[PDB]
Amino acid sequence: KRPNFVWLVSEDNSKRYLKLYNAKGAEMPNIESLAKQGLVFNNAFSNSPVSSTARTTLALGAYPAKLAMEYHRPFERINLPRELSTISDYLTKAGYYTSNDAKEDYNFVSPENNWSSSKKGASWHNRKAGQPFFHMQTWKTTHEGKLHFPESDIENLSTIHNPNSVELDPIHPNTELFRYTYARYLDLHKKVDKEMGVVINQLKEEGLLEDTFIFYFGDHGGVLPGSKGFVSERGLNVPLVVRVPKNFRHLLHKDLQAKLSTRVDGVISFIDFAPTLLELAGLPKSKLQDGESFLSKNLSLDDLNKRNTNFSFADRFDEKYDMVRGFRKGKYKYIRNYLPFNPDGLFSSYRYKQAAYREWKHLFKANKLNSVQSAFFKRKPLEALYDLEQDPFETKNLALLPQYTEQVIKMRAGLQKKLQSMPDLAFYPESYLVDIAKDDPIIFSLKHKNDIARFINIIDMSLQPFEQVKNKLKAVLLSNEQWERYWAMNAVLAFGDKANEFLPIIEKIRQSDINLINRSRAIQYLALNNGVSPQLELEDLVKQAKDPLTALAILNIATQLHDTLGIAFNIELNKLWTSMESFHKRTVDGWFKARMDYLKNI
């Protein structure tokens, strides 16, 4: 006898919006009913703040960044290495009936027979009699797209929840629109609970409850402004409930059997989900998985509550790029902004379809926000450190305070070690990485592990007093390796005017680098620091780029310059660059259209 599994997944939502975790959240009788014989997790987190990279993590039990899958949505899907597959593939091979309804959003090439059925209406019903099953289902009721309503809805559509009772995130302006948007999101939670009840009630009528582990969770944090798309805790924290079936209690430690509703405070990550299903199904862990099962025969509640670690990743989201790593350990959250000159408010078309987003930015421009509220739109610190017990909304950066020097240094080392040993493939720009790594990222990883260690050491030079690293950094700017010149230029950008001594070197890179992104970075530096007008050269370079991703990278730089210097760009693209193939081209073209329409006007 093997247990069944059900994954009930709502889109984009954090735990604060649920009454189960928050006194001013939405009542959800069906999910609250699950919790009655269930484990309720107070600290479950994805490892990235958007759908495709989070879903990818869930399936694989492994970090996307080490497999060249950190790019939403992908330009190239990546072929999986031999010793790593999806949990649906593993369960299917082991004889489970596996149904998915219907979202996938994988950044890997799908394994053959990945599911018994992945489509609208796919169901455990279609299993063979007595066959154990794994059902996954997505509800889009809470998706970001549901908060793209017109501002006039404030007066035209009433919310069930009362916006006047809303207690806003500290980084948000206290406005009617924001309190309204919040209430709309509370309303969507009431709704999705109803919809999910349909499925839970079928399992009940069919008598499957006590043979089945039922998981409910959000597919990442969100979705009010400053959450989804960022590795702040807002982007990562999700509700998580596991109703523990009576007939398979014996697979778990007595502490975890959920004979009464039980709270778990240990940090659970999305990398842990697949290893957990493997263990419960009696299957061995994948030799390339990063996560660890949180449901084991020998795992006590105390054991589980000691877990306190989560690494988070953010790179590309639609047309918009930035590079941020998050590292939470115990009560501290450490943030590394590798490209601090990119504000978090750097324009993304889809984010700003939410009217609250537009209002926030408008209020920033009008100088009506306090320092905590306006930080989202400004140049970032190279490092941020937060005490989540004292400051759960990450509003007070401790990194520059002398009494936290040791804490900063240690978490700095912890993150560098993690990213170097993984190794984090995203220190190669996507426009170089994915075309090569797509055949087998493990192969790329093995070949270039030390290169990535070098890239990380180069950029982290910007964490040192300029006088101590200037000679080292100068030599890197003159390196033969183009991606080392890239990361040295990025260090130079972090230094700002402190590195102005490098001007002739920077000017030469601007004129003559064989790499177009390296030219663009130098132009960026000179535009930001020395009054150079970048429009003409960047317009040319975008036109010169011989592949979509290189152009897109340069368009992101144009966007940063547009947002900071308030200048327009006129973009034309290089003429040089099957139903499913159509879909890919449409998505890519959308990215460029989004950039072109935006950059056109100040």
Added chain:
Amino acid sequence: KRPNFVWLVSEDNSKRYLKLYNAKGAEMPNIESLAKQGLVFNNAFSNSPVSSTARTTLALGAYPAKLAMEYHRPFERINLPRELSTISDYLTKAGYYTSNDAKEDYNFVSPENNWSSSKKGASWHNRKAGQPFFHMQTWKTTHEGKLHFPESDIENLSTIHNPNSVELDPIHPNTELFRYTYARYLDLHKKVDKEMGVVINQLKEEGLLEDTFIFYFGDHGGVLPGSKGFVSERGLNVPLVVRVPKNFRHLLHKDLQAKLSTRVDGVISFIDFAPTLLELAGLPKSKLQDGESFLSKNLSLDDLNKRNTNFSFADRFDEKYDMVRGFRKGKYKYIRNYLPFNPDGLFSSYRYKQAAYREWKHLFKANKLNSVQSAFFKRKPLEALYDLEQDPFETKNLALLPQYTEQVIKMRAGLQKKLQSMPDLAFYPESYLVDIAKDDPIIFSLKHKNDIARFINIIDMSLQPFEQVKNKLKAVLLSNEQWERYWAMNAVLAFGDKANEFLPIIEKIRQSDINLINRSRAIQYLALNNGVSPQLELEDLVKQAKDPLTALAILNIATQLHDTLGIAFNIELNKLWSFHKRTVDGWFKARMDYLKNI
């Protein structure tokens, strides 16, 4: 000097999908630019809810139903009477250069030299120097076929418009597929605007804008489920924008000159389009036309806004028959269902290629719909009455409420007089009508005007209490005229069990009526009300039918029994009997493929 005309026609689309009419509609900057110096009509309607009969109407300025042209697509095209022709023909004869690109879809036989040129790429560029022109062009971007995408598109192809903000029609279930489909249709509107912009910009660059009336409109309402193919307002309402040329403002009443952007609220019908062009060209109205110009020297905006009448017609769409008439007057909409035992959801192959259609039907069968949403699939009332001001989506049938008795009675009378006086030839079944009327429908009409009054009076006996009409009805059941027996049987079918006293007469019609459709009606009645198996009998009558339309009509009865009682039919056709051939064959394959299974 005479004005030019351009007709820019998008296919299958209603007004709610344009920003111009609806806050959640698609932006269409080129169309919207016509409005800048134009008239925007808020209540333009076709007189029928599908391409060929609506196209026919546009061209003739006259009701297809009075000309045996009410069938889509036509089995038999109808020759025009001497005093009625197309606007393209009338204009050509007056010296205009007429071009059509390129969709015709006419239910009449085309006049000789109907167009100066009618083909792909035909253009006003080929006119003689100085020659006034009429250019018609059709875009298929918004055609129904574009919504026949697979349900998997929801995951694979994201829409440009946001489907989450869509405010769905009340008869629709509020599902992801329906909102996604809606968003897809919005996308096609943004696309078709770009396409029409090409022709508008040519007219601009050539300096023809101020000598040319430019009309933009849809060729009937649609095209989400419940619209195209039905005479609810969904099937009929279309956008209509007319850019008024500076140099021919003198032809118009000051109110209509669009010196400022102007909204017109009066009801404009498709029969009105041809008379409008004749007047603007300085030509007389045809003596057989039904419409009246809405652009004129002496017509003020108030006079135009007083118009509030639309008559609408539904008979055959591909393989599916049903007979419905709509009568809109002022704030009221009246619907007469002559064959109320045919649910609107009666199967049609092309309709149900739209995924949203199949989901709707599935949710109906799963009993997951409310009563507003599920009426589409149910037996119809014989009459419906809707207050379009309080209830613009026609969801609350007022017709049985006592306080609306007089309104029902008056509009019933208004409709009856209209259909008798036209006269409406479709009270003759198509299988009999078109073979005979194809030579000249006006002569058929003259010969048989009283016969049609009688048919209308026969079927309308089903509006009375049974006891009050049973004697009269029985007599018609025993009439010597086959089509009176036909309409008497349709009356009996509407009365259902209330008429069971006629059982012997009905069983006799089943055994012995010379008319095979009459037998099939009796078999239909006996199956629905007496549990008598129709399967064998209808298989044999279809096989026995000596002409395609008779077989097709009997197959429709089989479809109604299939959908209502769950009965399968194994269909064989009579051995006795190019676009035409493919189209007819298509009808029968669709019926044969569908009936075979439950």
